[PDB]
Nucleic acid binder design. Sequence first.
DNA 1: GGGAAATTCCTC
DNA 2: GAGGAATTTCCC
Length: 25
Amino acid sequence: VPTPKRPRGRPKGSKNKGAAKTRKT
DNA sequence: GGGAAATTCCTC
DNA sequence: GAGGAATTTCCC
């Protein structure tokens, strides 16, 4: 309700869920 | 102060 | 309606 369009970016306290790293097995 | 990952807004 | 592109934040 305060600002209309939200800016582009990663919210505060957003942790990474899926790791884009390579798996071992 | 740089890099990486995630979310959002805009065009066709 | 759906997809592509751009910007922000956290950690070392």
